[PDB]
């Protein structure tokens, strides 16, 4: 806040302005197929 | 009947640590193409 207040007079104590956090957490995304490498050798598109 | 990769070894050092577990893999394959090309003979073994 901006305290006009009075003109001619001690000039008061403004509150200060206030600051928020955000707690943004990681977390693991994962995938793991079991892929037999049979079909990686046999595959003739790269299957991998 | 042989793949392309052929013999592949790998080491595997990792799951069982302490040992190597040397994975040594080959595609075989193997088929009676013409018949009539092969003969078997089965002795009386008396």
Same mark, same amino acid.
């Given at each position: 806040?901006?305290?006009?207040?009075?003109?001619? $007079?001690?000039?008061? #104590?403004?509150?200060?302005? #206030?600051?928020?956090?955000? %707690?943004? $957490?990681?977390?693991?995304?994962?995938?793991?197929?079991?892929?037999? #490498?049979?079909?990686? !050798?046999? %595959? !003739?598109? !790269?299957?991998? | 009947?042989?793949?392309?990769?052929?013999?592949?070894?790998?080491?595997?050092?990792?799951?069982?640590?302490?040992?190597? @577990?040397?994975?040594?893999? @080959?595609?075989?394959?193997?088929?009676?193409?013409?018949?009539?090309?092969? @003969?078997?003979?089965?002795?009386?073994?008396?």
């Amino acid at each position: 806040t901006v305290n006009h207040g009075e003109e001619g $007079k001690t000039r008061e #104590q403004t509150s200060t302005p #206030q600051i928020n956090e955000v %707690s943004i $957490k990681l977390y693991p995304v994962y995938a793991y197929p079991r892929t037999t #490498q049979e079909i990686v !050798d046999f %595959s !003739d598109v !790269d299957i991998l | 009947v042989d793949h392309e990769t052929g013999v592949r070894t790998r080491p595997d050092n990792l799951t069982e640590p302490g040992f190597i @577990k040397i994975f040594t893999q @080959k595609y075989l394959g193997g088929g009676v193409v013409d018949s009539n090309a092969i @003969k078997i003979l089965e002795l009386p073994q008396d």
